[PDB]
Structure formats: structure tokens, C-alpha cells
Symmetry: D3
Amino acid sequence: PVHILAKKGEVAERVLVVGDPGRARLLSTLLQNPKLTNENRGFLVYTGKYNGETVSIATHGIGGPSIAIVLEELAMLGANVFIRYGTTGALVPYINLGEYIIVTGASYNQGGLFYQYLRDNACVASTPDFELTNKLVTSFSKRNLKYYVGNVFSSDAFYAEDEEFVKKWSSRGNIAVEMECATLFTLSKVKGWKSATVLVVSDNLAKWITKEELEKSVMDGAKAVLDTLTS
Amino acid sequence: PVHILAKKGEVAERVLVVGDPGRARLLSTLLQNPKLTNENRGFLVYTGKYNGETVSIATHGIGGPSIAIVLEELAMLGANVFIRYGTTGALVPYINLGEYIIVTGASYNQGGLFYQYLRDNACVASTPDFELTNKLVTSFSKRNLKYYVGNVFSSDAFYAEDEEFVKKWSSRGNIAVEMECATLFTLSKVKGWKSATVLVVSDNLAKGGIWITKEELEKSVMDGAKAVLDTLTS
Amino acid sequence: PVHILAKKGEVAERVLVVGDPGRARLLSTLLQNPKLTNENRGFLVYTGKYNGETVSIATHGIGGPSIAIVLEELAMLGANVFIRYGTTGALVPYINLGEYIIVTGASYNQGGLFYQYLRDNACVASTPDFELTNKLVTSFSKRNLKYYVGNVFSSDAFYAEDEEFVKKWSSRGNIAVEMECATLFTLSKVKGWKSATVLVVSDNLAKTKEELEKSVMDGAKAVLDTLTS
Amino acid sequence: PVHILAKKGEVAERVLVVGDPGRARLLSTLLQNPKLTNENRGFLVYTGKYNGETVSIATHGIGGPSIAIVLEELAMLGANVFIRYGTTGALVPYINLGEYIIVTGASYNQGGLFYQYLRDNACVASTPDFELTNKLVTSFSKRNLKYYVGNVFSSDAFYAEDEEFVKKWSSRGNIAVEMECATLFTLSKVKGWKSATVLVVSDNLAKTKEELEKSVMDGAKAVLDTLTS
Amino acid sequence: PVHILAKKGEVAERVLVVGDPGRARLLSTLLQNPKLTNENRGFLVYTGKYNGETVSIATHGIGGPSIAIVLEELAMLGANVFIRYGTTGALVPYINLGEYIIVTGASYNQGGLFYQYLRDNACVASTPDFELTNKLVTSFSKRNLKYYVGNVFSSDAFYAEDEEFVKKWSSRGNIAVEMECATLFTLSKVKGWKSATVLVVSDNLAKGGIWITKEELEKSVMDGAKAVLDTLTS
Amino acid sequence: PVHILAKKGEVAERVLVVGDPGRARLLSTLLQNPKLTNENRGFLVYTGKYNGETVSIATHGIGGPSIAIVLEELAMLGANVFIRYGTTGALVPYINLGEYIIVTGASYNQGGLFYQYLRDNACVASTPDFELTNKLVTSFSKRNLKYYVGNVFSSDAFYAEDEEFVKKWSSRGNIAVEMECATLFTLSKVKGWKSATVLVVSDNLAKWITKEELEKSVMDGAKAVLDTLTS
């Protein structure tokens, strides 16, 4: 590896990946005896225990290219189970802020990364591991957390303009929008890794919350994700 | 509806769709008082009772263009829950004939039908209804049937040649190949229908030697059908 | 062949293909001593004689994927000449219902089937066999049938929406729309089969049952003449 | 028109188009009282009579972009019937140098010109006018000229490398390769022009100057007959 | 070489390529002892002296397919430095007729010629030789000629209709439109040739009212030509 | 903005963007009175003076999606001149480690980000600002720095496998490989920003160096870039 400078044995098999470095650190406090195993290029990687199991919490930055690089290196260091945990903008009105979304599939625009990996333009099903996603569902319900199940659209251009964004993607079976799921799912399915994703709705593009309520929402969801990784 | 000619209220909200009209007829015998509600253009459709619940079994033919037409007209006639039941060929050497595959997504080569519907080449997630697929899983394990869970590649060219067919598709997360799932899944997400699929392994491209007998297969078809009908009428 | 379970030699070298099983059975009435050589998966195939030639009438269902499968297996059974006969919707106001359209080429949207067969996205000329199409012209000319010669658009999504459908495809040199010609022609070109197509206009997207019936039947006779021409 | 500076009415309604300026001048010798109606940018255009009809002979240079520009402006000048006459390389071993190929369709690779005109990537049927191609058949038949009927591949890169060129395009139903047919046909279909094409085989990619010359000239006479048919 | 029929050593290493054969002839008069080295298929090629240095002026016709053929045969005959000189239409309202545009890159709709050469649809950087373009800049400012520097869109369809043509291409960093630069630039990078381009604004699509006189333009053509020839022979 | 939390007036018009947060900080010492104006999501943004001018040094992370987001927000805060400064792998043998590459164009694979921004698949010329790139050249030469001028290929999948990588991209006019230039150039040309790029060769895929020599190389190049931004 060349971005994640941790050494083999400092990265657990089970990994909770987040886009923000500040969140990884913040969430590292939910672990027993948290240890910073990397900080190169800003990709903070924490390792510790939870429910008598070794778990890592890594940063993947923003975008397909970035997370693809982080997954590849975490895997080279032993990781083979990934659960992305982030925030997202909902594409449907009936979903409120602070509630969660367990991802079942990712729509995406063809090209770049996908072309380079898939070697052609075929639309390979971009889905998470079935077992692991069901385990996520069981966890969130066990903790009485309000969650919705559906596909998301993984966008590459946050600021690109599209006058029909919400209608287009919502009418295409997508209930929210983020940026890494398509790369995570497809890359996982190719490399043989088990992956899933849970998102915190921080905005509704089709229809508010305090910073406290949100972090509380992020915290509750994290315990559910961490439970699943060690279940 | 110009292909399926059924009157008002002949098609049920829940529908088991198969490609073979013969299988549709054969499976209609598991229902109570099965009545033929359409036979136009060869698309046999039966409506009957199962566990005291009303369901329909319809023929969709082969290929996306065909199943799209059948699904669109069926929904027009009142259907909104579809469970495709058909045959497939495994792409992994660890799956035996007669066993079942519960579809979790569908890969596909874009263009054709998708372009006309999506108005562009975006790769929209082609997945089945999450809940419904779980019901099928519960149903199949409750009837102690051996099944695997994963994605399938929906081919449009049965006889097209590809020297790397198996390694390509199985390395892309697909454990089997069939021809209708991508269209069913994607079309469903757009129109708002609840769909899912269960396939019976009739061949294995990762081992083209083993084989199944007429009765062994048909027995394997009947078994799965009951599980599927339990789900549709649960 | 896993779909068309006809015996080898039980399928004529010359075949008239139609999308609906009902029509294949109805048109078999035009053969001498018609025999059902297959009924698997609803794909009815009848084999008999017309004039001094053995001829088959096969069903291909709806859609490129369906007709490709049928074409492939009929060939493995000895078929090398195919003439598709079906219904279609005109894209121009000057063609009346019941009139015929002799197909000269097919427009299509880049697709999986073409990609799987062609291996890339080239726009290969999707045309019928030149001689066969001219013989059809001669045949429909002899029986004094009103026909128009032109290209059609092979749609893959019957119910897909497009507010400019008629204008877009008619200004692109297409006078009608159906669903199997592009697959037929192109596959035929790559495989070496001689193929052609004549359609009966059952609708005009720009503008009686006996009206059609007789139209269908008369057309079939004209086609069978050509097949045994 | 900024390229073909011919006066309106100085271009016949029927036009024979060739890629090389030398040939257009050489074939004008076949017209009655030939007049040079344009020579701008090297695009020589001659107008005269053949039989009882006014006919023009225009140059289009090499490549889709070039012939589209010429076709567009000739039309703005009154042309609606175009017959391209050029050289070509066979993709099959059974066609001899000097023999002719009457074009039935053109295969092409998705491109800018097609995209700019069609507005999307659909594979629109790129074929000649059915009647015009049959008249050419009749004409080359009367003058007893050996011709073959089929599709060609319109390449955009003469020197682009492809170790499987011959096999790829010949197994896709193409018996020859040239560079302007696809543009001609498709543009003609969208614009409403009647177009056709006959090529003289000057090379075989699978297998005397007077040999060709006479071949060229004889072909031109056959084409002019058709143009004034 | 089947299009350009010149003997051994008739084409010079440095070459000024124009699309119009007439302009090629007209510009050959600025050379010393200009000799016609080819006229086959209308592609006039002249070889002569400028500032005691040997250069050639060749015709390439209209469009990428055409210029590709001419460039490939010329290089075969010994050429390896190309400077295209032609006309263009501005896409910005601040550029007047008779002024010049020194090309820094070329936009294009993929497919056709590019696919056959690149073997796929990657968008390879279509740029001119950096050094050579700077020489042209020095040359033009040294002759006090008004010029702008930027990218151009290489169209394959002169008469294709587009209701948003100008705003689309000018909003994408293109200050003009022509038909050959993309092919020249991209082909050059692949074969290893040194290329560049200078265009004379003969029209402005952001203001289709103003206009230039025959002599005013030809004078503007001759002026730029000298600057270009200084560069090729420097 | 939502990623770069700096306030309007804390981001200069002139900006030196780098992929690594640690480099931005390291390079901030070349400024007069450096001030950290943002650290949200790990995108460190420093502002200070150089040659009597206000300059910012920002982090853009890895990948088109990431840098596109950072440019968009820096611009919303006043930035309109960007010079990317990073490391790269050379595609040609004659270039040695530690030497520099002034970028004149970026090749890229179609799709994603480009499709979303350009609204179609056209290959828009992805080039830097002509003036600014020449000024970069003048700077590097004024400091006797060994540099090469050419196009680079902006890859989206660092770990994607391609057996013909080097031959393919080198024979296509590219002398090096990185990941952000195509997005930077094209996005700049559309938004009206003036951009350029200079790269440090840290590897040669077609044919070594110490960490000291490299940082020394990174430092020398930075002074040249900073000179250009204030020239």
C-alpha cells in the first residue's frame, strides 16, 4: 500500500468506513482501547475492540476514486468485510431528517472507475452482501431505530446542475443520494468482499434538525452498525 | 391491452409469472378452480385460489421486450405484485441441478429496452423488492428446499458466442444467467410494482456434465412453485 | 436445440415466420397436408407443402431475444431462408390499414443483443436479402396488392414513452415500426441466412376484422409464392 | 453555399458524384456540351446533357464530412437525386478487380457526423433509394457488366490499423469498403434525397490502367443511363 | 502513398497544410522557386524556399477523414512538422473578422475516425505541440498581428442543426469552430509529429452581422501566412 | 458551502491546491504569517502572504469527485486561479525521479463526473490556462529546475488492472499518470477559472530517490509555483 500506512495486523477484518476523518475519530470512542493505526494523507484509521471482537474504523474521503483506493489497501492489510456509514440527502418526502436508510442497491452513471475495473460498459448489479444487509436491518430494529430500505444514486458531481434531479432519480427507484455506494458494492462483488451500507438522512431534497440531534442520530446508528459487524 | 385480452377483474393483484406457457398451465393445477382468463398470442393466464387467496399465473415468453409487454398489460389489468419463476444456468461449480437461486439483483448490457425507458444510459439499480425477496427466503427454508442467494446476469443473446462467458459474469458477482430479471426488476422500480424472482437451476455452465431427469426437474419445479405460491398468498 | 424440439429434417429449408401462435396455425391451412412439427414453449411450427416445395411456418413470439432464439434453432434444424410476416404501425399518413409494407432495412437502438453478437457498438447494415425482397415485390405485384417499400424501426419497448416518436422515426427514413426485423436481418447477415419481411399495416400512428383477415391471408399467399418462387 | 459557388439553376436535379476531381473532369467528356459550373475549393462540378436530360457531375473529395458538405450545398442549388460512383476494396475473394459492386446498405461506426445530425446514437438504417438501386441493376444488366449486390463498410480512417479488418467486416455482411456511402444514404434519408451508389473494385483485400479506365468509363455510362432513366 | 504521388524527397520536413487547394497555390507564391510536387486527386502540394529554408505547402481538403489521409501520406514522404492554416468562425462576440486564433486544444464528438485509431472511446488529450505553438505566438506578435489564444471545437457536420450551438461550445472553453484540428492534434500525438494551428476568423457566430471584403480577408490571409512561414523556417 | 467551512475573505483569489493534507501544512511554512482557515472533513486550507500577495494553500484529496467539490467551494469563497501541485508516475523512461512535469493537457475516460457536468459524452478539450502555464514554465526555468512539458492521463482507478497501461497511455501522447487534472482543467474551462498544474515525478512506470531528495524536490517546485501565483 502507499496511502494507508498501517501495518498488516493493525487493520481488522471487520471495518466501519466513513467519509469524514472527524467522524472516524469521534466514533473511535465507542471502541474499547482505540488505537490510531494510520493518519497518512488524512485517512484516519482506528482499531480497537467491540463485543469481544477486533474492529477498525477507517476514513475513505469523498468520491468513488478515493474510497476505491482505501478499500483496496485496507483489504491488502486483511480487511474483507466493510460497512459504509455516512450521511445523505433523501429523494423522497416521507423520510425525515435523522432517520436512517439501509442501502440495497446503487444506481450510477457509467464510465471512469467502472470502465477501468469492469473493462467495458456493462451495468453490473451494484448491490451489498445480502446476509450482512439483513443483519444490519435486524440490528437497527433491535434498537428501535426508524429506518427505510431502498436503493440510492451514487453521484460523482455534487455541484453539477440538473433541473430534474429529484424526479429523475426518485422515479428510477432511488430514495436518496450519496457518492460512494456504487463503487463500494461493485468493487466488493468483484474482489469477493462482504459489504453493506447505512445512511443518516441529513437533508431532504424533496421537502430540519439541530447539530445535537444529528450527532445523536449518528451515534445511535453507529452502535447498531458496530453491533452488526460483531454479530 | 392488445396482447392479453382479459375482462374487468380477471387478473389478480398477486401474479406468478413464468416464461413457458406449458409450465403456466401445469402449475395452474395447484390452484382451486383454475380458470383460463386469456390465451391470445399464446400468453396463457390462469386465475385461481391458493390457501383461500386469489392469485394468477401468467406466461411472459422469452426476453425483456416480451416480458415488458406482458407486465405492462397485466398491471393495466390490475396486477401490482410479480414473482417470476423460471429456469437458469449456474455460473459457479458449487450449485447443483434442481436447487434454487433467489435473485438479489440483475446485471445487463445496456441499450435497447432500457434506453427507451430510462431515456439515457444510466445504470439504474436493477433490484427486486427487498421485503418480498425475504418472504421467499423464509418460504423456501420453511419447506426445507436447498437454495442460494445472489445476483444474475440477464442476457439478450442466448446463442451469442463468448469465450470468457462464465469467468466474466461469475467474477462480476453473478451466480447464474437467465434472460428476464433485469427488465422485470428495473421496470418494476419505475412503475412502482413489487417484484422478485426464484430460479431453478436446470444447467450449470461451470460443470456442463451433470444432468437432471425429466421427472427430477419437474418435481423440482413443483416443489419451488408451492413455496412461491405461499409467499404470494401470505 | 432446447426450445424448438422439432426433429432434424422436420423443418423445411424455407420458413415463413410470424410472431403469434394463432396466426401460424391459421396460415398452416394454406399448406398441403400440414404437420405440427413442434409446440414446445408455445412456439408452434407447422411443416407441409405449397406448390412443389416443402415449407414450414414457425412462431417467434415478441422481441429480438425471442426471434433470435427461434431463428438460431430452426437453422440448426436446416433452415436457411426466412421470411417474416407480421403486423405493424405506419409512421406516415399516406398508408392505409390493410395495405402492405415490404421492408428494405431496419433502424434500431444500440443494444445488448447486438452488442453480444457484434462484440462492439458498430452500426452494421441491418438489411434483408436483396434478391428475396425483390421476389416479394414481384409476388405482391402479381396478386395486385398495394404495397410500399421502405425501412422500419425495430422498437424494443412497446410501452416506452416518447412524445416525439412518430416525428423522430419518420424523419429518419422509417415508414413503420415493429419489433423483430433488426434482429432478423443482422443475425441473418452474420450467419449467412437469406431473409426478408413483409408487414401488414394494422395501425397508423400518423393518421374490420375481415378487412385484416383477408389482408393477412392474401399476404401469406403472396409470401408462400415467394418462398417457393 | 460557401463551398460550391455554382449559380442556382446551374446544377442539375440529377447528379453523379465522384470523390476525385480528375475523374469528374474525365467523365464530363461523356456529357453533351459540358460546362464547368464550379471549381471552388477543388470541388469541380460540370453540367451538361445526356440523352434528353440535364445532368451534373460533382466532386465530393474524401470522407463523410466532405461529401456531406457537398451534398447539402448541391441540394440548396436544386439537386435531389444523387448517385455516387467510386472505387473500392473487396472484402471477399470472389470479386475481381474491374468488376462492379452495386451498394445495398452501409455499415459504420458511431460517429460525430452521425451524432451531430441524428442527435443521438441510434443505428438508423443507412440504405440507398430502393427504386434507384434497382434501375442501376437494370442498367448494368443491359450493358452486360459483371456486378455484385451487397453492403459496404464506410471507414473513416484509411490508415487506422486493425489486424482483423477483412474478417470482421466481411462476416458482418459487407463485401467491400469505401468511405462515403453511410453519410450519403443516411443524410439522404433525413433530407428526402433519392440516392444510390455503384463502386468499381480497384482492389481485393481478401485475394492494367486500361483495365480500370475502360471499367470506369463503362460504369459511368451505365450510371448516366440510370440518372436519365 | 496512393493519394499524394510525389517522388523521393519532394516533400519537406516542415509543412504548412491548408484545406483549400486554391489557397495552397496562392500561398506558394511567397516561396522561392515554387515547384508543384503533386496534383493527384486535387491535393496540390508545393515545395519551395523561404528565408533560405525548405518548406512545403499541402492541401488537405475538408474534414478529419481527409486530413488524416493527407497527413499520413505526407509523413510517409518525409514530413514530421505540420502547421495547419485555415479559416474559422468565432464563438465569442469579442473577436473580429480578419483577426487570428492560435489553437491550444481541440474539442470533438467521439466515434468515427478516433475509434478506429484509438481502438476505444477514451478522450485522449487533443493538443498541439507546446513549443511550436509558442513559436507561432512569438511570430505573430513580432509581426504585430492581432490574435487570441484558446481551444476550438472540431465539427464533422457543417450543416447539422443545433439550437444551442454557440452557447454550448463557447461555454465549454471553445472560442471558435473549425473541422480539422482534433484529428491533426490527436493523430500527431500518436504518430509522433509536431503540429500546431493558426486560424483566420472569417465569420463570427456570436455576431452574424459584420462581414469582411474579398481583399480584406485575402490580405489577412497573406499576413498570417508570412508569420506561419517564419515559424516553420525558424 | 458545506465541506470547506472557511468564511468569505479567508480564501485568496490565488490558490495552490495539493492532494495531501500533510503537504498543505508542510508547504504553509513557505508563506508569511500562515493561518489555518479550515480543517473540516480533513481539507486543510491555509492562507497567508507571499511576495506581497495573499495566497491560499488548499487540500483537494484524491479523485475527480473530491477535487471538483473543493474547487466549487473555494470558488464560492472567492478563488478563481488554481495551480494544482502534486506527485505522479511517469509513463516515459527518459524522465528521472524528482524532476518536474508542467501539464499541458489531460486525457481521461468518459463518464461519471464529466457526463454530469457536460450533459453528454463529448470530449471537451481538457487543457490549462495558456498564460498561466507559460508563467509556470518561466518560473521553473528561472530557478534552473529540470522539467518536461506534456499531457498526462487522469485515472479514476489507481488499482484497476491493465496489462498495457504504460504502452497504451504513453503512445497516446501522455508522459505521466495522475488523477485530478482532467477534472480541474475541464471544470475550470467551464466555470471560467484560470488553472494550471505542475507535478513531481515520484515514480517511473516505464523504468530511485530518498525521502529527503523528494521533499527537497517538492519544496523547490513549491517556491516556483508560489512565485507564479504572485507574478
